[PDB]
C-alpha cells in the first residue's frame, strides 16, 4: 500500500518550475531559500532529496505557486560558458611575447605550477597564492 | 532487416474493443484492420490502428475485401489530425493463422513496403507474451512450390511510453510485484524462467509427433538446428568448471560474508539508538 | 430512389484479347459499363459502381465508389489477360456485396463472360443453391466468344431464379462482332 | 431535476485517447468529442472518444467541423457499430481543470442540442499514477444565480465527498458549473492482458551478467565502501555530545556514512545472490 | 469582400504573446532552463517537433 | 543480524498520534482559499 | 559417430581408417579446417586432435529415436531442479 503513496507525491515537480537558491534551514526538512525573483522565503522540501547534496550555495527548484523546494540542480552560469576551447584559443605563443623573462616565469610560478605541482606547496607548505593582480601602463 | 516491433497498450486495447463491438455477430468474424505507426532506427513502431469492414464465407475461403475507400478517408483524417502518424502495416485478430492471411498483405502491400501483420489474442492466457508479428518473405527455392511464400515471425514485445504509463499504472490498481530486490528476478525469471524453458522443451516435443505418424514432409530444414543443439550441449564436469567454479563461488561468498558482517553491526547501533530513547525517557516522562 | 448497388464484374481473362467488336473489346464493353453506370447513376444518385473480376487473381481494381474516374483510369492499359476462374467469381461477387454500406440494398450483379469456362456444374449448382440460400438475383450478360449456347449458364440462371426467384435473366452472347450497344440495349430497357 | 449524484461511467479506452491526444499536441488546448450511449437521467456511460484535428495556430477550442463529425459519425456507422454523441472535451494542459470563458461558450453551444452534454477537461502533466485531473463539469444556470436559489436538490450523500480544487474554485465552479463524481469500468478481460504483458523478461535471469566484471564491480563498490566505513569509523565518535537534533540539522552539507553505508550492503547483496543462483541452475538444467 | 476583410479581424485578433526568452542551457531532452528579459530564471519545456 | 533485528524493536513505543496537518488552520486555508476563489 | 564424451581421435586412427600416411594427415586436416567442415584443434606431440564441431548431416527415422530419448530424461532434470525452486522458494513469494 505504502509504495502507492511513495512515488505518488512527486507530481508537483511536473514542469512549470521556477528556480530559487538554497540559503539555510531552521531545522530538519524545513528551510529558507533565496529566489531568483530576488525575495527570500521560508519553505518546505521534498523528502526524497538527499540533504547532503545541499549548500555549496545550492541551485534549487521551487514550486511556482506553493513556493517550496522541488529539486536540487547541477550548476549553471550564463557567462562565457567555459571558453569553448576549439575556436577560442587566441593563438599567442610564449615566443610571441619577447622580453618578459622575469614576469612570464614568475606568473608561471604563480598560476599553473601550483595547479600541477601542488604537493610541493602542500608538502613544504609555502601557502600558494590565492589570487594575482597585474597592472602597469597600457600596451 | 527489421529488428523488432513496438506495440502499445493503446493499440492492444484498440483491437480488443473492436472485437467487443463486433462481438454481437456471435458466429464468426475475425478482427482485421489497418496498423498505423512508424519504423525508425530499424525499430518497428505501432502507435495507432483502426479496423476495416470485413466478411468471410467458409465455402470459398479465398475471398477477402477491404473497403479501401474507408481506408482512404479515415487515414486521410488520421494523417490530417496527425501528419506524424502514418501507416505501418495491418493486423488480423489471429487465433490460429487464417488462410486469407497470406494475401491480405499482398492485397495492401501497395501502401507499406514492409506491410507487417500482427496476430493478437482475444482470450488472453499463456505463460508468456501473446503478441505476434510476422513478416513477408518469398522464395523461388528448394522444393515446396515454384511460387512459394511463407511468413516469418519477427520478435515481438509491448512498447512502453511515458504518456501511456500514467494510464497503464492508473488503470492497473490491482497488483504490482515491485520492490525489485533479491526476489524480483527470482519470480519474474527464476520461477517463471524455468517454466519458460518448459514450453520451449514442449514445442520440439510437439514437432516430435511425426516419427512415423504425423505430416508427410519429414525434415529437410529442421534437423541442422536439432543436431546443433545436442552438438552444442554444454561441457561436462571433469575439468576446471568445478575448480574455477569453486574459485569464483569461493570469491563471491567473501563479499556476501562482508555484507552480512556489516549489517548486524548497523542494526546493533540502531538498537543502541533505541535504548537511549528508552532509558533517558522513562525517568524523564514517567 | 430504389436501394441497390451495382458491382460490375469485368472480364480480364486471356480469351478477351482481340479487336473483334468495333474499336476493341476493351473500349466496347468499357463504354458499355460507362453508359449503364450513367444509367444507374442518373436513375438513382445513391448507387456506387465498382468493378471486380473473376480471373486467376480477382483484384478489386477499383474500390466500390460512385466515382468513375478510377474506373476509366485503371481500365486504360488494364491488360485484360489471365486464366479465367469463374468458380470464385460467385463468392468474389457476393462477399463484396456483403461488405457494402447497406444490406438493405437489392443485391444486383451484372457478370461478363467472354471466355471458355472450366467450372463444374455441380460446383455452380452448389453455389447456385447457395445463392438460393442468400437470396441474390444476378443478371449474366455474355460477351466475346464462349462455348456457344452457353454451357453451365442456363442451369445456373435456372438454378438462380428457382424457388420463386423468377426475375433473373441470361443475356447470351451472339458470335458476331457487331456493335455491342444493341447487344445490351435490352438490359438497359427492361430487366 | 438532478440529485447531484450523477456517477459518470466512462471506459477503459477513452482515458487512453484523452492522454494520447492531450499529450501529443499538449501546449495547445486540444479538443474533440465524446461518443457514448446516454443512459438514464442520473448516469451516463460514454464508451468512446474520437478527437478532432485543429483549425490553426492558437491555443483555442475554436470550432467544430460538422462535415468532419458528420462523415466521422457515419464512418463507424458503416464500419464498426453505431454509437451516440453525448459530450465533448478540451484540455487545460498543465492547469488542472476549470471552465474558462471560452470553454463555457462552446459548452453553451453544446447544451442546446441535448441538455445533458458534458464538459470535460484533461490535464496531462500533473497526472502520474493515482492522479488524472479530469473532473467533468457542466454549466449551472446563471438565471437561478439571479434567483438566489440553490440548485441541484441534494437527496443522496454522494455529491459532497470530493473537495473542490481551489484553481477551479477561483473560476465559475460554484457559480457557473458543477462537478460530477465519476469512476471507470474495467474487467478481467483487460486486466490480465495488460498485467501479464507490460514488464515481462524473457531469459534474462537465466544469464551470467558479464562474468569477468560482476566480481570486478564487486570490488568497485568495496574499495570506496572501505573509506565510507572510515566515515562510519568517524561519525559514531561524536556521540555522547551535542543533542542529535543538532546532528539532524547539522548534517545537510556533508555526507553520512550511515545511510550511504546500508545502501551498498543491499546493493552488493542483491548483485551477488542473483548471479550466484543463476550461475548454478544452469549446471543441472544444462547437462 | 468588405465583410470578408472584417471577417479577417473576426479571428485575427486572437494571437497571444510569446515572451522573449533566451536559452541558458538544456538539462535533458525535454528539461530546459531559461531566463527572459524580465527577471528570474525558469525551467521549461518545448513542443515535440521544434 | 536477525537477532540484532529481533532484539531491536522493543523500543518502538509512545507513538501517540500521526496528526496530518491541523483543523483550525485547515479552516483558515479553506477560508482564505474562499477569499481568493471569490477574488 | 564418436560421442561428446571424448571425440578425440589420433593420427594413427586416421592412418588406419583412411590408410594415408603420418606426414599427410596433418596437411589433410589443415585443409579440413581451412574449408571448415570440422572444427577442432591439432596437437602434434601427443598425435591427437580435439575435434569439436562436425558438419551436420541428414538422418533417417532412427536417429530421432536416440535424440528423443536423450531429450526425454533431459526434461525431468528440468522438472527435478525446478522442483527444489518451487519447494524451497515457496515462502519467498507465494
Ligand atoms: N613582446 C611584446 N611585448 C610587449 N608588447 C607587445 C609585444 N608584442 C606585441 N606587443 C604589442 O603590445 C600590445 C599589448 O597588447 P595588450 O592588449 O596585451 O596590451 P595591454 O598591455 O593589455 O594594454 P591594453 O590594456 O591597453 O590593451 C599589443 O597590442 C601588441 O601590438
Ligand atoms: Zn480550457
- According to DSSP, the residues that pair with C171 across neighbouring strands are C141
Alpha-carbon distance A39 to E39, whole Å? 12
Alpha-carbon distance C36 to D122, whole Å? 54
- Residues with Cβ within 8 Å of residue C148, at least 6 apart in sequence: C175
Does one domain contain both B156 and B248?
no
Query: Do B100 and B83 contact (CB within 8 A), yes or no?
Result: no
* Closest CA–CA distance from residue F11 to any residue of chain D (Å): 17
In a domain, B206, yes or no: no
Q: Which long-range contacts (CB under 8 A, 24 or more apart) does F1-4 make?
A: F1/B260, F1/B263, F1/B264, F1/B267, F4/B264, F4/B265, F4/B267, F4/B268, F4/B270, F4/B271
B192: exposed, middle or buried (C-beta count within 10 Å: 0-12, 13-18, 19+)?
middle
- According to DSSP, the residues that pair with E34 across neighbouring strands are E23, E42
Query: Do D85 and D73 contact (CB within 8 A), yes or no?
Result: yes
Annotated binding residue D171: no
Can you tell me which atom of ligand 1 is nearest the CA of A138?
A: 23
- According to DSSP, the residues that pair with B1 across neighbouring strands are none
In a domain, B95, yes or no: yes
**Of residues B131, B76, B81, B119, the one with CA closest to residue D49:** B81
Does one domain contain both B49 and B132?
yes
A43: DSSP letter: E
Distance of CA A130 to the CA centre of its chain: 18
A72: DSSP letter: E
* Closest CA–CA distance from residue E37 to any residue of chain D (Å): 22
Give the Å distances, CA to CA, from D90 to B135, B181, D66, F1.
40, 42, 17, 57
D106: DSSP letter: H
Alpha-carbon distance D77 to D83, whole Å? 8
Candidates F11, F13, F14, F16, partner chain B, best to mutate (most B CBs within 10 A): F11
Q: What one-character-per-residue DSSP string does D128-188 give?
A: SSS------EEE--HHHHHHT---S---STTSTTSPPPHHHHHTTHHHHEEE--EE----H
Does one domain contain both B69 and B12?
yes
E47 in D contact zone (CB under 8 Å): yes
Q: Using the beta-carbon criterion (under 8 Å), do B57 and C94 form an inter-chain contact?
A: yes
Q: Which long-range contacts (CB under 8 A, 24 or more apart) does A107-115 make?
A: A107/A132, A107/A134
B249: DSSP letter: H
Q: What are phi and psi of F30, to 5 degrees?
A: -75, -20
Residues of chain A in Cβ contact (below 8 Å) with chain D:
4, 7-8, 10-11, 14-16, 25-28, 51-52, 54-55
Q: State which of B149, B182, B215 marks the end of a domain.
A: B182
Query: Do D210 and D36 contact (CB within 8 A), yes or no?
Result: no
In SS3 terms, C14-52 reads as CCCCCCCCCCCHHHHHHHHHHHHHHHHHHHCCCCCEEEE
Q: Give the DSSP H/E element, type plus range, for residue B10.
A: helix B9-21
Alpha-carbon distance C12 to C113, whole Å? 9
- Residues with Cβ within 8 Å of residue C56, at least 6 apart in sequence: C82, C83, C84, C85
Q: What is the dihedral of CA A92, A95, A99, A100, to 10 degrees?
A: 60
In a domain, B14, yes or no: yes
Sheet with B118-119, strands from edge to edge, namely B48-51, B32-36, B87-92, B118-119, B132-133
- Residues with Cβ within 8 Å of residue G1, at least 6 apart in sequence: none
Query: Do B190 and D205 contact (CB within 8 A), yes or no?
Result: yes
Q: Give the DSSP H/E element, type plus range, for residue A17.
A: strand A17-27
Strand B138-139 vs strand B148-149: parallel, antiparallel, or unpaired?
Answer: antiparallel
Contacts C91 to B, Cβ<8 Å: 57, 59-60, 63
D249: exposed, middle or buried (C-beta count within 10 Å: 0-12, 13-18, 19+)?
middle
- The C-alpha angle B43, B45, B49, rounded to 5 degrees, equals 160
Does one domain contain both B138 and B69?
yes
Query: Do C10 and C71 contact (CB within 8 A), yes or no?
Result: no
Nearest CA to ligand 1 atom 7: A97
Query: Do B140 and B148 contact (CB within 8 A), yes or no?
Result: yes
C149: DSSP letter: T
- In units of Å, what resolution does this entry have? 4.4
Count of CA atoms in the C-beta half-sphere (13 A) of D174: 15
- The C-alpha angle D163, D168, D169, rounded to 5 degrees, equals 70
Q: What are phi and psi of C179, to 5 degrees?
A: -85, 125
Alpha-carbon distance G72 to D127, whole Å? 53
Does one domain contain both B100 and B229?
no
Q: How many CB atoms lie within 10 A of CB A136?
A: 6
- Residues with Cβ within 8 Å of residue A135, at least 6 apart in sequence: none
Alpha-carbon distance B267 to B259, whole Å? 13
Alpha-carbon distance D266 to B225, whole Å? 42
Alpha-carbon distance B36 to B48, whole Å? 5
Q: How many CB atoms lie within 10 A of CB B44?
A: 25
Q: Which of E14, E47, E48 sits opposite D58 (nearest CB)?
A: E14
- According to DSSP, the residues that pair with A27 across neighbouring strands are A30
Query: Do B22 and D80 contact (CB within 8 A), yes or no?
Result: yes
Kindly report the length of chain C.
191
Q: What are phi and psi of C112, to 5 degrees?
A: -115, 115
- The C-alpha angle G90, G93, G94, rounded to 5 degrees, equals 70
Contacts B259 to F, Cβ<8 Å: none
In a domain, B174, yes or no: yes
Alpha-carbon distance D15 to B169, whole Å? 12
- According to DSSP, the residues that pair with C49 across neighbouring strands are C65
Does one domain contain both B52 and B170?
yes
In SS3 terms, C66-114 reads as CCCHHHHHHHCCCCCCCCECHHHHHHHHHHHHHCCCCCCCECEEEEEEC
Method of determination is cryo-EM
Alpha-carbon distance A29 to A6, whole Å? 17
User: Residue B157 is part of which domain span?
Assistant: 2-182
Indicate if the alpha-carbon torsion angle D100, D106, D109, D115 is positive or negative: negative
**Of residues C108, C176, C93, the one with CA closest to residue C142:** C176
Kindly report the length of chain G.
94
Q: State which of B149, B164, B182 marks the end of a domain.
A: B182
In a domain, B187, yes or no: no
Does one domain contain both B236 and B176?
no
- Residues with Cβ within 8 Å of residue D4, at least 6 apart in sequence: D152, D153, D154, D156, D158, D159, D178
Annotated binding residue D90: yes
In a domain, B216, yes or no: no
Q: Which of B177, B211, B223 sits opposite G59 (nearest CB)?
A: B223
- The C-alpha angle A44, A50, A55, rounded to 5 degrees, equals 75
Give the Å distances, CA to CA, from A123 to A106, A113, A117, A129.
21, 14, 10, 15
- Residues with Cβ within 8 Å of residue D34, at least 6 apart in sequence: D14, D46, D48, D49, D85, D86, D87, D88, D89, D118, D120
Does one domain contain both B252 and B148?
no
Q: Which of B260, B274, B278 sits opposite F1 (nearest CB)?
A: B260
Q: State which of B132, B150, B182 marks the end of a domain.
A: B182
E strands, chain D, in order: 8-9, 32-37, 44-51, 85-90, 119-121, 137-139, 177-179, 182-183
In a domain, B236, yes or no: yes
Does one domain contain both B175 and B229?
no
In a domain, B62, yes or no: yes
Query: Do C150 and C113 contact (CB within 8 A), yes or no?
Result: yes
- Please give the biggest Cα pair distance in chain C: 42
Q: Using the beta-carbon criterion (under 8 Å), do E14 and D60 form an inter-chain contact?
A: yes
Alpha-carbon distance D40 to B94, whole Å? 38
- Residues with Cβ within 8 Å of residue A16, at least 6 apart in sequence: A64, D94, D125
Alpha-carbon distance B87 to D97, whole Å? 34
Pocket lining: A97 vs ligand 1, CB cutoff 6 Å: yes
Does one domain contain both B10 and B111?
yes
Overall domain count for chain B: 2
Query: Do C10 and C25 contact (CB within 8 A), yes or no?
Result: no
Does one domain contain both B130 and B267?
no
Does one domain contain both B11 and B152?
yes
Amino acid at each position: 500500500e505504502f509504495l502507492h503513496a511513495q512515488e505518488e507525491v512527486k507530481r508537483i515537480q511536473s514542469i512549470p518550475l521556477v528556480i530559487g537558491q538554497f540559503l539555510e534551514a531552521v531545522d530538519q526538512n524545513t528551510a529558507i531559500v533565496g529566489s531568483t525573483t530576488g525575495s527570500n522565503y521560508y519553505v518546505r522540501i521534498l523528502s526524497t532529496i538527499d540533504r547532503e547534496l545541499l549548500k555549496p550555495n545550492a541551485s534549487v527548484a521551487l514550486h511556482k505557486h506553493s513556493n517550496a523546494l522541488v529539486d536540487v540542480l547541477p550548476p549553471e552560469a550564463d557567462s562565457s560558458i567555459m571558453m569553448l576551447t576549439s575556436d577560442q584559443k587566441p593563438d599567442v605563443m610564449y615566443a610571441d611575447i619577447g622580453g618578459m623573462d622575469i614576469q612570464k616565469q614568475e606568473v608561471r610560478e604563480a598560476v599553473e605550477l601550483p595547479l600541477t605541482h601542488f604537493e610541493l606547496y602542500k608538502q613544504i607548505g609555502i601557502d600558494p597564492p590565492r589570487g594575482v593582480l597585474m597592472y602597469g601602463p597600457p600596451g | 532487416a527489421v529488428q523488432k516491433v513496438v506495440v502499445h497498450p493503446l493499440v492492444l486495447l484498440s483491437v480488443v474493443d473492436h472485437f467487443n463491438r463486433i462481438g454481437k455477430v456471435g458466429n464468426q468474424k475475425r478482427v482485421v484492420g489497418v496498423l498505423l505507426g512508424s519504423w525508425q532506427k530499424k525499430v518497428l513502431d505501432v502507435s495507432n490502428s483502426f479496423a476495416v469492414p470485413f466478411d468471410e464465407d467458409d465455402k470459398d475461403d479465398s475471398v477477402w475485401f477491404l473497403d479501401h475507400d474507408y481506408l482512404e478517408n479515415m487515414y486521410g483524417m488520421f494523417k490530417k489530425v496527425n501528419a506524424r502518424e502514418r501507416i505501418v502495416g495491418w493486423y488480423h485478430t489471429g487465433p490460429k493463422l487464417h488462410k486469407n492471411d497470406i494475401a491480405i498483405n499482398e492485397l495492401m502491400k501497395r501502401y507499406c513496403p514492409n506491410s507487417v501483420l500482427v496476430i493478437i489474442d482475444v482470450k488472453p492466457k499463456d505463460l508468456g507474451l501473446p503478441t505476434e508479428a510476422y513478416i513477408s518473405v518469398e522464395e523461388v527455392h528448394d522444393d515446396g512450390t515454384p511460387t512459394s511464400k511463407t511468413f516469418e515471425h519477427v520478435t515481438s514485445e509491448i512498447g512502453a511510453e511515458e504518456a501511456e504509463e500514467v494510464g497503464v499504472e492508473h488503470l492497473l490498481r490491482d497488483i504490482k510485484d515491485t520492490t525489485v530486490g533479491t526476489l524480483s528476478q527470482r519470480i519474474t525469471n527464476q520461477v517463471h524462467g524455468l517454466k519458460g524453458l518448459n514450453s520451449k522443451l514442449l514445442d520440439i516435443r510437439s514437432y516430435l509427433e511425426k516419427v512415423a505418424t504425423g505430416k508427410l514432409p519429414i525434415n529437410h530444414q529442421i534437423i541442422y538446428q536439432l543436431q546443433d543443439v545436442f552438438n552444442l550441449l554444454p561441457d561436462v564436469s571433469l575439468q576446471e568448471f568445478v575448480k574455477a567454479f569453486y574459485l569464483k563461488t569461493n570469491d563471491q561468498m567473501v563479499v556476501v560474508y562482508l555484507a552480512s558482517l556489516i549489517r548486524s553491526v548497523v542494526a546493533l547501533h540502531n538498537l543502541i539508538n533505541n535504548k537511549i530513547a528508552n532509558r533517558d525517557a522513562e525517568k524523564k516522562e514517567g | 430512389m430504389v436501394l441497390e448497388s451495382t458491382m460490375v464484374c469485368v472480364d480480364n481473362s486471356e480469351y478477351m484479347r482481340n479487336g473483334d467488336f468495333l474499336p476493341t473489346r476493351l473500349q466496347a464493353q468499357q463504354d458499355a459499363v460507362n453508359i449503364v453506370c450513367h444509367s444507374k447513376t442518373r436513375s438513382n444518385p445513391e448507387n456506387n459502381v465498382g468493378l471486380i473480376t473473376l480471373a486467376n487473381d480477382c483484384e478489386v481494381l477499383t474500390t466500390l465508389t460512385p466515382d468513375t474516374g478510377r474506373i476509366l483510369s485503371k481500365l486504360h492499359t488494364v491488360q485484360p489477360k489471365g486464366k479465367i476462374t469463374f468458380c470464385t467469381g460467385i463468392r468474389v461477387a457476393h462477399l463484396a456485396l456483403k461488405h457494402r454500406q447497406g444490406k438493405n440494398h437489392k443485391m444486383r450483379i451484372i457478370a461478363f463472360v467472354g471466355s471458355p469456362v472450366e467450372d463444374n456444374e455441380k460446383d455452380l449448382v452448389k453455389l447456385a443453391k447457395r445463392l438460393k440460400k442468400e437470396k441474390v438475383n444476378v443478371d449474366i450478360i455474355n460477351f466475346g466468344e464462349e462455348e456457344v449456347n452457353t454451357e453451365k449458364l442456363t442451369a445456373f440462371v435456372n438454378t438462380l431464379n428457382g424457388k420463386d426467384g423468377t426475375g433473373s435473366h441470361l443475356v447470351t452472347v451472339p458470335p458476331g462482332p457487331s456493335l455491342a450497344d444493341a447487344l445490351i440495349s435490352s438490359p438497359i430497357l427492361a430487366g | 431535476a438532478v440529485d447531484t449524484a450523477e456517477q459518470v461511467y466512462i471506459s477503459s479506452l477513452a482515458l487512453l485517447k484523452m492522454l494520447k491526444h492531450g499529450r501529443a499536441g499538449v501546449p495547445m488546448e486540444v479538443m474533440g468529442l465524446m461518443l457514448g450511449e446516454f443512459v438514464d437521467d442520473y448516469t451516463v456511460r460514454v464508451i468512446d472518444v474520437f478527437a478532432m484535428p485543429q483549425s490553426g495556430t492558437g491555443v483555442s477550442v475554436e470550432a467544430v467541423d460538422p462535415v468532419f463529425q458528420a462523415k466521422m459519425l457515419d464512418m463507424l456507422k458503416q464500419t464498426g457499430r453505431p454509437e451516440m454523441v453525448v459530450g465533448w472535451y478540451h484540455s487545460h494542459p498543465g492547469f488542472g481543470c476549470w471552465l474558462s470563458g471560452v470553454d463555457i461558450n462552446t459548452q453553451q453551444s453544446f447544451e442546446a442540442l441535448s441538455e445533458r452534454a458534458v464538459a470535460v477537461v484533461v490535464d496531462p502533466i500533473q497526472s502520474v499514477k493515482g492522479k488524472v485531473v479530469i473532473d467533468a463539469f457542466r454549466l449551472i444556470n446563471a438565471n437561478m444565480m439571479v434567483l438566489g436559489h440553490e440548485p441541484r436538490q441534494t437527496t443522496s450523500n454522494l455529491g459532497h465527498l470530493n473537495k473542490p480544487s481551489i484553481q477551479a474554485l477561483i473560476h465559475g465552479l460554484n457559480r457557473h458549473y458543477y462537478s460530477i463524481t465519476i469512476n471507470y469500468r474495467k474487467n478481467e478481460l483487460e486486466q490480465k492482458m495488460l498485467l501479464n504483458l507490460h514488464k515481462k523478461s524473457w531469459m534474462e535471469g537465466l544469464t551470467l551478467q558479464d562474468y569477468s566484471e560482476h566480481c570486478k564491480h564487486n570490488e568497485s563498490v568495496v574499495k570506496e565502501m572501505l573509506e565510507l566505513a572510515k566515515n562510519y569509523n568517524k561519525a559514531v565518535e561524536e556521540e555522547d555530545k551535542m543533542t542529535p537534533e543538532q546532528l539532524a540539522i547539522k548534517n545537510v552539507g556533508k555526507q553520512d556514512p550511515k545511510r550511504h553505508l546500508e545502501e551498498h550492503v543491499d546493493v552488493l547483496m542483491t548483485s551477488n545472490i542473483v548471479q550466484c543462483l543463476a550461475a548454478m541452475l544452469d549446471t543441472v538444467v544444462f547437462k | 469582400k468588405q465583410y470578408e476583410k472584417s471577417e479577417n479581424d473576426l479571428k485575427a485578433l486572437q494571437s497571444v504573446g510569446q515572451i522573449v526568452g533566451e536559452v541558458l542551457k538544456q538539462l535533458t531532452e525535454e528539461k530546459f532552463i531559461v531566463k527572459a528579459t524580465n527577471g528570474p530564471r525558469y525551467v521549461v519545456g518545448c513542443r515535440r517537433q521544434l | 543480524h536477525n537477532m540484532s533485528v529481533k532484539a531491536m524493536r522493543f523500543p518502538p513505543k509512545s507513538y501517540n498520534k500521526d496528526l496530518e496537518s491541523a483543523e483550525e488552520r485547515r479552516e483558515r486555508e479553506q477560508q482564505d482559499l474562499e477569499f481568493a476563489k471569490e477574488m | 559417430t564418436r560421442p561428446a564424451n571424448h571425440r578425440q581421435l589420433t593420427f594413427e586412427e586416421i592412418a588406419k581408417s583412411a590408410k594415408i600416411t603420418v606426414n599427410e594427415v596433418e596437411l589433410l586436416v589443415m585443409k579440413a579446417l581451412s574449408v571448415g567442415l570440422v572444427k577442432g584443434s591439432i596437437d602434434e606431440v601427443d598425435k591427437r586432435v580435439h575435434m569439436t564441431w562436425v558438419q551436420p548431416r541428414v538422418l533417417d527415422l532412427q536417429q530421432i529415436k536416440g535424440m528423443k530419448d536423450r531429450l526425454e530424461f533431459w526434461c525431468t532434470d528440468v522438472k527435478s531442479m525446478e522442483m527444489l525452486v518451487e519447494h524451497q522458494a515457496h515462502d519467498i513469494l507465494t
